[PDB]
Design a protein around this ligand. Sequence first.
Ligand SMILES: Cc1ccc2c(c1)c1c3c(c(C)cc1n2CCCN)C(=O)NC3=O
Length: 275
Amino acid sequence: TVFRQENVDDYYDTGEELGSGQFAVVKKCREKSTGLQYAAKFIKKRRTKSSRRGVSREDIEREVSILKEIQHPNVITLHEVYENKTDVILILELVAGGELFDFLAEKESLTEEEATEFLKQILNGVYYLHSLQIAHFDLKPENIMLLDRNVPKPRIKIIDFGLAHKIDFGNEFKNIFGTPEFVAPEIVNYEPLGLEADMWSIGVITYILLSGASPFLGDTKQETLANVSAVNYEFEDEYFSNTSALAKDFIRRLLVKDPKKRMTIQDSLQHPWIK
Ligand SMILES: Cc1ccc2c(c1)c1c3c(c(C)cc1n2CCCN)C(=O)NC3=O
């Protein structure tokens, strides 16, 4: 697909850097015509099959494709897409609030009820995504951003659709992932994937949201992958002493090895802990 060929620097005033990845850099920017602030994600094109650097066109095309289809309050919105000889620039909505977990670290421990306030927003967004048969495939704290952190009840936005996929009938999908600590066993054992994987991550995220401790993070990468696969974790009284029974039951119904037995996003919204 053909993207905007004009130089992004002709319509935007690129500036400060917000974050860096192996094949991408996101800089803050200001649109010249509106004076509005956005986020500029510079994805490095592979532009040479043999090369293991840069991202493949197919992968970029897919993220853009999914992004273009998204339109929900709890999901980042794609503004424009430019490209030149080396990069594909995605002008994304700006979540000036930064990471939800950084904002939370700056306040007194949230009550379980307040924690649920944020989690619900996450669920809403994932509810939208799964309703569109789209799996994020990379849900993790760092991808839970805040639109504005200087407001009564800050809004959360799910970002990074680089791993997102359009789950369609007819053909199974084997593997694609990131951080072991947050992926589901299906991903670890390269077994067929689906919307269930996102639900697993949700359970992992709520667990951290409540205890502040990761449920599967081990000493070595291998240990984590083994912890996740063996689906072994615990609600050690040290961290889950002030955690309701309903809270734990929610996490339990999500941290299930067998996908078909795991709670669906529809179920989670109806769970008594969420009410
Ligand atoms: C205010 C702020 C700070 C850091 C940001 C971002 C925004 C940010 C943004 C986006 C992405 C993909 C990465 C981003 N990062 C990198 C870190 C993501 N955990 C994005 O799509 N919008 C952002 O504001």
